[PDB]
Amino acid sequence: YKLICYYTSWSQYREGDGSCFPDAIDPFLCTHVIYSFANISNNEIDTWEWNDVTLYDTLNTLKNRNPKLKTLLSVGGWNFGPERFSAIASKTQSRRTFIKSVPPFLRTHGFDGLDLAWLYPGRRDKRHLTTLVKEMKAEFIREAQAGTEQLLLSAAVSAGKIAIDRGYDIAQISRHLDFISLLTYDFHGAWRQTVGHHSPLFAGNEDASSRFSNADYAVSYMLRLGAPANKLVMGIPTFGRSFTLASSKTDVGAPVSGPGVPGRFTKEKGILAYYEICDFLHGATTHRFRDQQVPYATKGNQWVAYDDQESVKNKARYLKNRQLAGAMVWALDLDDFRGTFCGQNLTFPLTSAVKDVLAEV
Numbered sequence: 001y002k003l004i005c006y007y008t009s010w011s012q013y014r015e016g017d018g019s020c021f022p023d024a025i026d027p028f029l030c031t032h033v034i035y036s037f038a039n040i041s042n043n044e045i046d047t048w049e050w051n052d053v054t055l056y057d058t059l060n061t062l063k064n065r066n067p068k069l070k071t072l073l074s075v076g077g078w079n080f081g082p083e084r085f086s087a088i089a090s091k092t093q094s095r096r097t098f099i100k101s102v103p104p105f106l107r108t109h110g111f112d113g114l115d116l117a118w119l120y121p122g123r124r125d126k127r128h129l130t131t132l133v134k135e136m137k138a139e140f141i142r143e144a145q146a147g148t149e150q151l152l153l154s155a156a157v158s159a160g161k162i163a164i165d166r167g168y169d170i171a172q173i174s175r176h177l178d179f180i181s182l183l184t185y186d187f188h189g190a191w192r193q194t195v196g197h198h199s200p201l202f203a204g205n206e207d208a209s210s211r212f213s214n215a216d217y218a219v220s221y222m223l224r225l226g227a228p229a230n231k232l233v234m235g236i237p238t239f240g241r242s243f244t245l246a247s248s249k250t251d252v253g254a255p256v257s258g259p260g261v262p263g264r265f266t267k268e269k270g271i272l273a274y275y276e277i278c279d280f281l282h283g284a285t286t287h288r289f290r291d292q293q294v295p296y297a298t299k300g301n302q303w304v305a306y307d308d309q310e311s312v313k314n315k316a317r318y319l320k321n322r323q324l325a326g327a328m329v330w331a332l333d334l335d336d337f338r339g340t341f342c343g344q345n346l347t348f349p350l351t352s353a354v355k356d357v358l359a360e361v
């Protein structure tokens, strides 16, 4: 099984214990670590943070400890305008230029592959995404003639039915990608006036309307569209999404005034790292959606939807039962990486819980 794990560039800037650098990563935890995110300048892949080349080097020395470890560099991401990807992909010349610049960059910095995080392709982009993937892979196949191990090509893909139908030719790109990471954790929160869980495993008969917004539907759909299970990787979040309640009602459907109050370390309204949730739980009431099989918690007027060791292990068994290639975790720096916030003196409790299940039959 594969355990794909993301590490984010900007996590180095968090204060105190929240600060996370690549060397905090256990070399034997994941099978693949992906550095997010690279930028595109003058139609060429490029660094993003001022100290990326140094962090690239720090991440890749982990391979001196675990020679089996593979690293990839992800381009795009949420703060990368998808229109920018559009412009590059729609013109054969700017597209060829970008593709040509990738291998030498990856080779210079020690990466084993490229991860595409175009979030998200539109109806007019579907055709060009296919072209980009095809041609990128053809270039990787050609570069390997030089005697070096062929570069890996992956892509992070939306798990929303409508987003998939609109921007991706799943049957086509599946043939060229080494693996596809399903973003099965962005099913709610996204500017909605009600409380709900962003990463439910199952639909849950109670309130059948967002019948498509659960991991089980996304996986089944991808398999139906033509993607092989052995190339599919299910996304598991290491963060939670928060809401400020508009009323004293805490159960399903309850009013919401806006995103939750920022975490002390992550400082982003609406999000909380797992290590911040561990702290939040003290004095909170915990609940669990039995149908969806994921927990949530409340304290005062704050409502948090998250994943714990139990729900994460549950998702890992589900993916094994459907014979998928493995799991993807977003993100290592959001898990209790120091292992000092969540109690049991365990480093990376969430990611480790997933690894344990994956290591069983």
Ligand SMILES: CC(=O)N[C@@H]1[C@@H](O)[C@H](O[C@@H]2O[C@H](CO)[C@@H](O[C@@H]3O[C@H](CO)[C@@H](O[C@@H]4O[C@H](CO)[C@@H](O)[C@H](O)[C@H]4NC(C)=O)[C@H](O)[C@H]3NC(C)=O)[C@H](O)[C@H]2NC(C)=O)[C@@H](CO)O[C@@H]1O
Pocket (backbone or CB within 6 Å): 010, 013, 037, 049, 050, 077, 078, 079, 080, 239, 266, 267, 268, 271, 331
């Ligand atoms: C669940 C999850 O992980 N969500 C992410 C989402 O958060 C990502 O967006 C990221 O959000 C945070 C803010 O919420 C951004 O953090 C800033 O990152 C920049 C670097 O890109 C930092 O700039 C640097 O600042 C330090 C000072 O501390 C200087 O030393 C650096 O030199 C300076 N860079 C220079 C010189 O220009 C800044 O400190 C961070 N401040 C914050 C707000 O914490 C983060 O950048 C941002 N990511 C991006 C790419 O914009 C999102 C990513 O797209 O993905 C998920 O949705």
Ligand SMILES: *[C@@H]1O[C@H](CO)[C@@H](O[C@H]2O[C@H](CO)[C@@H](O[C@@H]3O[C@H](CO)[C@@H](O[C@H]4O[C@H](CO)[C@@H](O)[C@H](O)[C@@H]4O)[C@H](O)[C@@H]3O)[C@H](O)[C@H]2NC(C)=O)[C@H](O)[C@H]1NC(C)=O
Pocket (backbone or CB within 6 Å): 039, 040, 041, 042, 043, 047, 048, 049
């Ligand atoms: C990620 O890559 C992006 C490029 O694809 C990049 O986007 C931006 O790139 C510049 C960085 O901020 C930004 O620069 C502004 O452009 C002006 C003119 O283009 C520039 O003035 C001139 O500067 C020198 C001469 O002094 C000249 O050589 C330049 O060509 C330029 O004409 C302004 O002072 C200013 O620098 C671009 O506007 C912007 N482009 C886009 C995509 O809109 C990101 O900065 C890169 N990395 C990140 C975000 O960290």
